Each structure stands twice: as C-alpha cells, then as structure tokens.
Symmetry: none
Subunit: 84 residues, 4 copies
Amino acid sequence: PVAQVPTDPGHFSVLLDVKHFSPEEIAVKVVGEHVEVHARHAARPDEHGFVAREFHRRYRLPPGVDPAAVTSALSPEGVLSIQA
Amino acid sequence: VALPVAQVPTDPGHFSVLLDVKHFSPEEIAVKVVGEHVEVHARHAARPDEHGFVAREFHRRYRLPPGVDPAAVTSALSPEGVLSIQAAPA
Amino acid sequence: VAQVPTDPGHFSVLLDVKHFSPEEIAVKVVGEHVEVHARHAARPDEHGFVAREFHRRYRLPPGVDPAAVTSALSPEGVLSIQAA
Amino acid sequence: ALPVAQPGHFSVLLDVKHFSPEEIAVKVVGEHVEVHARHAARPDEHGFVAREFHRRYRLPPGVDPAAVTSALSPEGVLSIQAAP
C-alpha cells in the first residue's frame, strides 16, 4: 500500500540546537516583528577545560502573526522548536 | 513591547515530526507512506561550500500510531527549512 | 599574563561525525584532495529509524605528500584531518 | 587513492570558522591558556546571529607558559600548542 505525501508551504517554523544550555539560560521573546533567542551560560567544565558560551539570534516573523500565537518547545535532546 | 514566548509541550497528542532539511531543495526530498510507516528520503549530490565540496543523504522511517489513516498524513516545509509531518488523531 | 601570537597554520579541518562509528568512516587522499566518506545503515533512534551518509572533499595545499596527511577521531566523535 | 589510517604535550584544536582573526584572542595567564572570541550580529540564512565564547585550559605540569604558540588554518581551525 503506497501513497505519496505532498509537501505544502507551511507556516514559520525553526529548529535550533541549544543542547549546551539549561532552560533558565535560554530566553525566547517576540520583539516587534522579530522572534529573538538569547542563550548564555557562565564558565562550566567540559572534557577539555572550562567553557562559557553566549549567542543571540533574531528571526524575522511573517506579516500576519499575532505574537501570542508564537510558540516554542524544547525537546529532551535540547532542540528548540519555534513556530507561528 | 517584548513578549516572552509560550512554551508548549513537545508532544501535541498526535503524530508529529519535525526535521531540519535546509540543505535540500523540495525536489530532493521525498515523503511517502508505505504500509504502516512514514518514510522520508533526502539527498543532494556534491555542491560547493565553505572549504570544498559536500554531498549528503539520509532516510528515516516512523511507524504510524495505531488507528491512523495513511491518507490523513500530510507534510509542510517552512520558509526556514523545517519539514513537518503530521496526521490527524482519528 | 601574556598575549600569544596566532600564526598562519597548515591545512587543518574539524568535522563533527558523532553519528558514525570509526568503522563507518573512511578517509582517503586522491591526488590533491582529501576525501571523507561516512555511512551508517538504518538504526533506531528517539522517534523512528534513521540512516545517514555524507561525502566531503577538501582541497590539499600544493605539494603535500599524500602519505603525510593525518587524521584522528576524538572520543567525542570529532574528526581532525591535518597536512602539516 | 591512498587510505589514511585514523603525554605531557599541550595540544588543542578549536573550530573558530565564525570569527575574523581579530575577533580571536589567545592568552597565557598563570598556568592557564585562555581563548576569547566574539562577533557582533550579522545576517545568517534566515535572520541574524551574534556569538561569543570563552575557554580556559590547564597547561600540563611539565610545560612552560612562555612556550605556548597558536595558529589558524585556512579552514578555520585554531590550534594551540606547547612542548615540555
């Protein structure tokens, strides 16, 4: 029993790897027409020595989006999904 | 003014799959239902990037949840290169 | 306290190949290119099954002895290839 | 085709491909080597990204601080080395 599934044009949706960061160390917010993602952790030991990291990303949202409709989920594997 | 984003669960109750396919054009990606499984195949031949050439390929299968109709399966591609595959609970 | 000078170094690449085991990776020198080939058969993971394969080519610097190129796989699954 | 095979010395490799050479700083401080890198927001595939990290490594007991050198490959790998 074989069917092809057509791939449609979908809404705003991004995947970000953030496995190095705890939930409290990651902030996702809507500012204006951008979704911002800020992530930061202070010095921490890994296998090599000590490491501290920080990034800031911005994604432009599409026109017809209510900010209260933007959602986010963090998989156990540390992948952040953001949709709108 | 800055609005903190609502943090839903990773599980929406029904069949749901998200995959990053930013390296592939739509024609290089194939989604099908075969028996009780959803298959996803993606491949691109060698292309230039940062310091030489790269070619990539993967294949994934997921068992549809019990009682789900294959015809109800759908997929979409976000502008940001995220492939979503879903089926209505049924 | 002392500033260490960063000099122009020799050919060196790092390649995350953590999804593959040492047996599932081959490195070879073909003329003036170093090639990486990696492949794994379908195996289970979090949500279903996955198989993966990639092929990469890096251009070597002029006049390098193909015997002198070296590679190493760290415990973390990062592949280092160098041609000093 | 030629198939390449896969102590108290200091040797590290870091992927710093995202940073200009003047955004990367390597210092010897006491018995530690420190690396700092930072770049401002720049466009990415679908938005903007800024990144920063700080790493500290412990020099092995039989290694002299003043001996530490560093190099950047054409492919964006920073190597930091020292001999006993």
